[PDB]
């Protein structure tokens, strides 16, 4: 469903 | 900034 | 068989 | 340090 593997682009919100 | 990397968790929205 | 998506972990090689 | 984040691209080995 949808497409391509999960939601957004990275993991998690911000960098560090 | 924030917690981890980018916005989300993977890549596009959904599977496929 | 393939596992997740992609190889190893986050995008790119370090932090920067 | 280096480029981008992490050491490799999205997560896991291939693609499942
Ligand atoms: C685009 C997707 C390609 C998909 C096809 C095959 C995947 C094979 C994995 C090879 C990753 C290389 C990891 C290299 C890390 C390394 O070179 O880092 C240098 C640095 O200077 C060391 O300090």
Same mark, same amino acid.
């Given at each position: /469903?949808? @497409?391509? @593997?999960? /939601?957004? #682009?990275? #993991?998690? #919100?911000? #960098?560090?």
């Amino acid at each position: /469903v949808g @497409a391509x @593997a999960x /939601v957004x #682009w990275x #993991w998690x #919100w911000x #960098w560090x």
